[PDB]
Scaffold this active site. Sequence first.
Site, PDB file in Angstrom:
ATOM      1  N   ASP A 155       1.024  -0.842  -0.038  1.00 19.20           N
ATOM      2  CA  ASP A 155       0.020   0.160   0.046  1.00 19.20           C
ATOM      3  C   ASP A 155       1.038   1.324  -0.278  1.00 19.20           C
ATOM      4  O   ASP A 155       0.207   1.697   0.404  1.00 19.20           O
ATOM      5  CB  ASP A 155      -0.869  -0.559   1.245  1.00 19.20           C
ATOM      6  CG  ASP A 155      -2.115   0.608   0.810  1.00 19.20           C
ATOM      7  OD1 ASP A 155      -2.227   1.562  -0.260  1.00 19.20           O
ATOM      8  OD2 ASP A 155      -2.888   0.978   2.138  1.00 19.20           O
ATOM      9  N   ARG A 159       0.441   9.365   0.822  1.00 19.97           N
ATOM     10  CA  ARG A 159      -0.235   9.374   2.342  1.00 19.97           C
ATOM     11  C   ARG A 159      -0.611   8.458   3.188  1.00 19.97           C
ATOM     12  O   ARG A 159      -0.268   8.762   4.547  1.00 19.97           O
ATOM     13  CB  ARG A 159      -2.815   9.420   1.765  1.00 19.97           C
ATOM     14  CG  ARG A 159      -2.655   7.522   1.527  1.00 19.97           C
ATOM     15  CD  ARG A 159      -3.387   7.237   1.006  1.00 19.97           C
ATOM     16  NE  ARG A 159      -3.699   5.728   0.512  1.00 19.97           N
ATOM     17  CZ  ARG A 159      -3.685   5.548  -1.551  1.00 19.97           C
ATOM     18  NH1 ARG A 159      -3.361   6.161  -1.760  1.00 19.97           N
ATOM     19  NH2 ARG A 159      -3.230   4.333  -0.921  1.00 19.97           N
TER      20      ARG A 159
END
Length: 294
Positions: A155, A159
């Site tokens: 991932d 962010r």
Amino acid sequence: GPLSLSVDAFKILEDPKWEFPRKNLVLGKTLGEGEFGKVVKATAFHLKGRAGYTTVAVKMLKENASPSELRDLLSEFNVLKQVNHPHVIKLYGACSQDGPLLLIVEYAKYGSLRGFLRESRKVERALTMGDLISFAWQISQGMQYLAEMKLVHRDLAARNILVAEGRKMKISDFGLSRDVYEEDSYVKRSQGRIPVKWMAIESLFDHIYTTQSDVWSFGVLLWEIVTLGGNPYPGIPPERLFNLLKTGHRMERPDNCSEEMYRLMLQCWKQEPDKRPVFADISKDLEKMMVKRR
Ligand SMILES: Nc1ncnc2[nH]cnc12
């Protein structure tokens, strides 16, 4: 099932090294909400040898958590116990005994890399290409370490990178990370929870995740860095990515991006995972651009 086994085992595991007294932790404002959970600012008294209060961050389940979210929090805890690197977020402990599961992690005072970049501009905050290159290099160093540990992050995105004191990058959000010691690949029959626009072509189509799909995500992350927190594939709906990627399209060179930097991004996004650079190579390419600019 698998989760009930994990929870029971967790609840019995006498874990003096990581367990922290709930009464010594005081939670404060929300710093953010990931899709698996929320992070709040906190302070911990007498944490791991440090006298007095230490400001930390605390990861916990959102309201109405699902088994998926609980599994991810337990997994993140298990991964973070085994990793130690200056550019990976540090685990301090957990509260598991008499209330909701809380993970106590390193606090990064600047918040997410994405938010940090978007608040800036290139010369509010003033960043040079040198700074941008530096950020990417630190992240690449961290990833080389995780790849060596046979972990696939899955991932990677601006962010999910945090910015600590001294503008130091910290890779964060290990809830989706998986061990690949045995097969060097992690494969899932079900649909993944990673945003489509950060996924490698073989992850999107074939559900295969390896260090070289982490490399693809790093290329998207590189693009986010270079664009001071741009939105990948802007204006393109995620469902269009299957066709776009398989027909060989990639994001175009953005403004304020050298030909060398753009070449590195494209290399991260090669159809064939074996043709992509390894993090070691990525670090060497970035260090090279850093010294050539002086
Ligand atoms: N660990 C953390 N430290 C600081 N800001 C954060 N935002 C999300 N997680 C954070």
